[PDB]
Structures are given as C-alpha cells and as structure tokens.
Design brief:
part of a larger assembly, 2 chains, A: 117 residues, alpha/beta, 5 strands, 20% helix, B: 63 residues, 0% strand, RNA-binding, ribonucleoprotein (chain B), ribosomal protein (chain B), structural constituent of ribosome (chain B), Ribosomal_bS21 (chain B), Small ribosomal subunit protein bS21 (chain B)
Chain lengths: 117, 63
RNA sequence: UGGCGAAGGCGGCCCCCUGGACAGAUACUGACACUCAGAUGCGAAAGCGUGGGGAGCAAACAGGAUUAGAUACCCUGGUAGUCCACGCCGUAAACGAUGUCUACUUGGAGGUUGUGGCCUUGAGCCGUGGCUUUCGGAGCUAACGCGUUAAGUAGACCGCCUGGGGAGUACGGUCGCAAGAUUAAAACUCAAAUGAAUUGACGGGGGCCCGCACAAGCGGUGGAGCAUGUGGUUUAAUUCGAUG
C-alpha cells in the first residue's frame, strides 16, 4: 500500500446497479464496491440503500490506503446518487468537491429503440 | 459542481446544480431514441395544452 | 404553435457558389396577366444498381425469457439497411385529409421580420408593410366546426366524385433492373356502406368517494364423527319445486 490522503470517489449510478470506485487523484483504482456485490440482488440492487452499503464497504476498504479527503464524481441517473455521497460523509471522509460526471452527448449516437412493453 | 464550503448543504446544492444543467432530464431523453415525429407531436400537444390552459385560466364564480 | 423553402424538406461553426422573399425610394415597361388537358421537372422513408464506408442503431436471423402456444411484445446478440458518390424508383395519414389566382366582408390577444415618425424627452410610444399563431362575430355548415391565413360573399381556370363489397383488383398499354408504379374494368353480390352528433353501457382510461371491501384483529369452514340439505347413483317408487 502507498498511503494516500487526497482521493476521488467515482459513483456510477446506473438504473440497475451502483458502483463506487475510490481512486487516487490520478484515477488509479484503490477500492471498489457495488450494490450487486454488497449483498443485494435483482430488485434491491436498484435501491438507494444497496448503493449506500457499496459506498460503506468501499469506504472501510479505502482506509487501508489511509484516505481522508475525497472529491465525489457522481455519474448517472440511478437511485444510488445521493445515498452513496451521504455514506462517504458519514464514514469520516471529508468531501471537498461533489462533481457530476454524467456523459451527455451533444447529439451523437442513436439511442436504443423505445421499449414497447 | 459544488465545492463543499457542511456536507448536507453541499449535497442539496449539488442536487440543485445538476437540476439546472438538466442532467437527469437529458439522460432520460437519451435512454431510448425518440422518433422525430413523436418529438414534434409531444411538443405541439405541449404548446396546445399550455395555451388551452392560459386561455380558460383567464376565463377563470364557483360560489 | 421561431425561421426558411413550391412541396418533399432544412439545425454546430467557418468559407465558397447560389435561389427566393421582404421593405424603402425613385425611375422604368405598358396588360407583358390568371389558370392549365397533354407535357416536363422536383418529390419523405423504405427499396434497387454500381463503388465506397460502417461508430451507433437495427428488418432478417440466433439464443434467453413470458405463454396453453409466443413464428410477438421483453432481454442478450445481430445482418441488410441506416452514411457517402452517381443513378434508378415516384410512392406516403406526401395532411390543413382544405387546388391555384383575384376582390370584398365586424373584432380581441400574440409571435416574427422590415420601414417611417416622435422627444431616444428614459429601454418606449404611435404609424406603415410582409409572414405567422390563437380566440371569436356575421355568415356558412348535417353537425363537428370554419370564421379577413374562410369552410363567408363572388369571379377565372384546373383536378376530382356519383351506393357498399368485388377493386385500385383483372386484362391491355406505358414506365421500371426489379420491387412495383400508373392508366383502369366486369361478372357477381349486398340493402346497405357511411358522416357528425345524442343517450346509455363498457374500458386492463382519468379524477373523486363509500361498504367488515381490503388492511388491522378475533373466531371459524376446508380435515374427524355425526346432523341436515343438494347432486349423483341406486330404486318398483326414492314425489314436485328451488341452481352463481
């Protein structure tokens, strides 16, 4: 382990799962945790609370590297946007900046077809 | 983007900083391809409803 | 419910080539106009040919689910196609389901693009044009509605209709590489087909409400043995009726 104190939390909140990848500021991965690896499956992955746990699990694995300050980059529309960020505050970590990093095409590729469900 | 200058404020300020860049709005637009005809149909009915509101909401006794 | 274009259609930014519209001002020509059978041209998307290109998407197709089945909807993939060049095709609910041109006939509120004036005495206000949106008057209309952008009042010319099926089909011609387009019947058959609006009922439409309706509880039935009724079967007869 290289001990780092300043880092970046990259919350990837899909509508299905939520991934949390705490990195150094140079974007090398240190820890990751996912709603659908932190216990919850099918329906319950896609809940705030599953993502919270992902964040918690990742947080208490990020302390091995001795991280202290994180910037949160919240990327996507999922339920695990807000909850993960709370779970980083309420796990010690000082949050410096909360960026949104959602990829927005400036008209680009034709999305998949509409679901005639 | 929100520099945390308490966190609880900062996350609310974050949540309103991404409302205002219509970020979640935009993702939901671009999840599935709206066929151009359907886009226009929605936009007309929008304008049409908005007017047909205001018009009768100027015609707006009750008791 | 901004703009431009005949329509189809056209969306980053920059340049080059280029069409149209509009306004102001003065001068010009002197009815040179309007409409148009036939003809010609342009004409979404798909499709077709040849050659490229191919991120994403996705007919077909494959697999996974769902289901009674699922040649579907859903999921994972995925090819033609989608893109470019040059042709072809000529069709769409190509729609305002509303031919073009002209004149006339109450208003209200907007948008947009010119132009003039005022004191720009302070973003403005008032005139005057073009285009466009909406609401309504008379009138019109079967009604719904249309209503100076008419579906009002008239004129010019063109296109087109003549009960529903058969059928925009057959045959013939023309056109096309093909797909097919275009022109376009008849036998036979039916006494209707149809428009708008009305009242209901219904909707796996919306809103709002109520009941031991559900929820919350409590005790049952379903299981046992008996009682009782019914069905069935049996019987000479198991009288007849009551059946969500």
């Amino acid at each position: 382990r290289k001990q780092v104190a300043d880092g970046v939390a990259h919350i990837h909140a899909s509508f299905n799962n939520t991934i949390v990848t705490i990195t150094d500021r140079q974007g090398n991965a240190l820890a990751w945790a996912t709603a659908g690896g932190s216990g919850f499956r099918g329906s319950r992955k896609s809940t705030p609370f599953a993502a919270q746990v992902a964040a918690e699990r990742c947080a208490e694995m990020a302390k091995e590297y001795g991280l202290k300050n994180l910037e949160v980059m919240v990327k996507g529309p999922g339920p695990g946007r807000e909850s993960t960020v709370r779970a980083l505050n309420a796990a010690g970590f000082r949050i410096t900046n909360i960026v949104d990093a959602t990829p927005i095409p400036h008209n680009g590729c034709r999305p998949p077809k509409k679901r005639r469900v | 983007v929100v520099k945390v200058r308490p966190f609880d404020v900062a996350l609310r300020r974050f949540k309103r900083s991404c409302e205002k860049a219509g970020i979640l709005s935009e993702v939901r637009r671009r999840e599935h391809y709206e066929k151009p005809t359907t886009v226009r149909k929605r936009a007309k009915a929008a304008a049409q409803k908005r007017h047909a509101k205001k018009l009768a909401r100027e015609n707006a006794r009750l008791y």
